[PDB]
Subunit: 206 residues, 2 copies
């Protein structure tokens, strides 16, 4: 019968899945690339005043970001796009610990910014000296809400879910009613363990 | 019946759409990330630029990135002052359309493809003007990408499909696969994001099996 319109509704969902993952994968990889390039280009030893201006310039007009920060070896925030009320320290963060040990870039899961209270995930790049000692950290915090609006903006009338590897809702876009009786086409992102589920839309009057 | 040729054909077409999206994204990513890298460099450098430091930055950026033909820094005149490629002569690029537009627009430029003056290979470039305080263009970052790197990426993923990339003038940028696989097919087509190349993915025909 109209299994025909269903199968097509399904491949549309698949097409959407790849579009949206590609977008977010792109956003994450691009940010990583920006940070990596900053680390390479800035005169060493890092001058804090210069870093401060660079983060401001980079942060400027990129709703992508919750904030951009720079940390010292101890994990104190020493440069920041958000005016900081008190001293802030992120050495307790999972991504900080991992970044310190691996001396490699780290992407975090969603949490609530100590600095803004908003939900975010971060990209954290260790800055190394000549002897490959980790001395500082670039920290790029992305607003989860930006990703949500990004997806919503393109697929407002499909229901999509983003869930981490443990079932925690990262976010959803669109009306859940659309998912009734639908199995989702789904897949994980590249650099972060978030699973995206796109529900095909129902077969309607035709 | 004959209606099941239609059925298979439709799947072939769909697969063509799938490849169009997959392959465009790979190129869009390359271009976008390169723009982002170049822009971050332009912001992070301390004026007045030390050309030896710049040379070092470009080498480190270039290292292990088959994507790149080369990376270059230009003075305000278009002279190449730093180069990942061993230059045998002075090189000036001020005559390039991308240079002229970068200078005039004071914004990032993604060029059409052409034959590199430096390596003789097909390339296209990402050019980012470096501004001073009064927003005067003082220098240029230039990232030259190998067309053939893009062609070989695609051909290696989709060896059995014929795919064309073409500019607005109708110039073939590159093709991949055997043109014969396209006989009696309209391609599925679409543009890249940052440069107006159009990619055409041809559906494979319905074989005997069936």
């Amino acid at each position: 019968e109209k299994d025909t319109i269903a199968a097509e509704h399904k491949q549309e969902a698949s097409v959407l899945l790849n579009l949206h993952r590609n977008k977010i994968n792109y956003l994450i990889g691009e940010t990583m690339a920006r940070m990596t390039s900053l680390s390479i280009a800035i005169d060493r030893p890092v001058d804090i005043k210069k870093m401060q201006s660079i983060l401001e310039k980079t942060f400027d007009s990129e709703p992508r970001f919750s904030g951009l920060y720079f940390l010292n070896a101890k994990g104190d925030v020493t440069a920041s796009t958000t005016e900081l009320k008190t001293k802030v320290n992120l050495a307790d963060r999972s991504f900080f610990i991992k970044a310190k040990e691996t001396k490699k870039t780290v992407i975090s899961d969603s949490y609530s910014s100590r600095i803004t209270g908003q939900p975010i995930f971060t990209i954290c790049v260790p800055v190394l000296d000549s002897k490959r000692n980790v001395t500082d950290y670039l920290v790029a915090a992305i607003q989860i809400d930006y990703l949500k609006n990004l997806i919503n903006l393109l697929s407002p009338d499909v229901y999509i879910e983003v869930v981490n590897q443990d079932g925690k809702m990262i976010f959803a876009s669109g009306q859940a009613s659309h998912a009734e009786d639908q199995k989702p086409v789904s897949g994980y992102l590249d650099d972060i363990s978030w699973n995206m589920k796109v529900y095909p839309n129902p077969v309607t009057i035709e």
